[PDB]
Amino acid sequence: DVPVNLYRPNAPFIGKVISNEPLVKEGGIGIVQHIKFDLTGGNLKYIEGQSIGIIPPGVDKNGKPERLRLYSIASTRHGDDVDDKTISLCVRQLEYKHPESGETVYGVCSTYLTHIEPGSEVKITGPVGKEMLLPDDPEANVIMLATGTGIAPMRTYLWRMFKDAERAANPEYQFKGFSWLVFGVPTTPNILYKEELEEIQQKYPDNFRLTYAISREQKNPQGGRMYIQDRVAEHADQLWQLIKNQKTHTYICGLRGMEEGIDAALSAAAAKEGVTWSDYQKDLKKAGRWHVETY
């Protein structure tokens, strides 16, 4: 029932770019683009939580072909237009430091993708991943802990859950559980999909809670910048009480190193009731209720 590896690196799907919109608004940090691809002419199917590979053009410094980089799928199975013909990605341009040869180094595949023109052909492989899939249980609770581009799989769940055209397209899935997104970003102009996330919270105030950790605008109780781990510690008792429900699934996605602060908050909360979190978390992973994708 889960599509996997319908296309592989030795014979990828050649899709075309339809659009390439900026997501970071004026005053924000960096470049993050929303890129939609045409899937007509092939049989690429996918579902929510999965990833696809992109093969960038060119050769590395040794003269070898550039390999694929994985990107979380940012659209539901139906695409943004709910027509089953497209797929979207949420790509941040990677750039960095002086202690790495030269001055500023630009990532090959993320620079390629964030500056790609409509009409351009792209090499696509996949889909891949069964670690971040959404339960078909409409009464599930869904905790979502994201930073930056880790918002991508979360957007596929929330759109499936709360978009009107999705609800009309998926008769089998009419969500009525509770979902909570904690989204960590550096500025308010960096809140990817801010307008659409906040519209969902207005229509479904009993089914969706939205919490931000904005580091250049908020301080934690110790005086430092507000990060997602500071927000998780703030609500650690509530998050633990929801995690004890048999229906609750937790998703964590973003850049590596966010998992350590989430566990230390949830550890202190579990300890109060005589539970060892790291032991409890193993059972959750085997049960398929603890989903992690960091990179």
Ligand SMILES: Cc1cc2nc3c(=O)[nH]c(=O)nc-3n(C[C@H](O)[C@H](O)[C@H](O)COP(=O)(O)OP(=O)(O)OC[C@H]3O[C@@H](n4cnc5c(N)ncnc54)[C@H](O)[C@@H]3O)c2cc1C
């Ligand atoms: C499952 C999965 C899902 C992903 N989803 C997304 C997504 O939705 N959106 C998204 O933008 N990205 C996503 N990523 C990351 C993405 O695959 C690529 O790694 C990223 O876009 C950078 O690729 P590049 O080709 O731009 O960089 P490369 O050109 O390969 O540059 C990366 C290399 O340079 C180095 N480097 C990187 N950062 C630094 C730093 N601060 N200091 C020093 N050296 C550094 C390392 O050697 C790293 O291997 C995902 C990764 C995985 C594994």
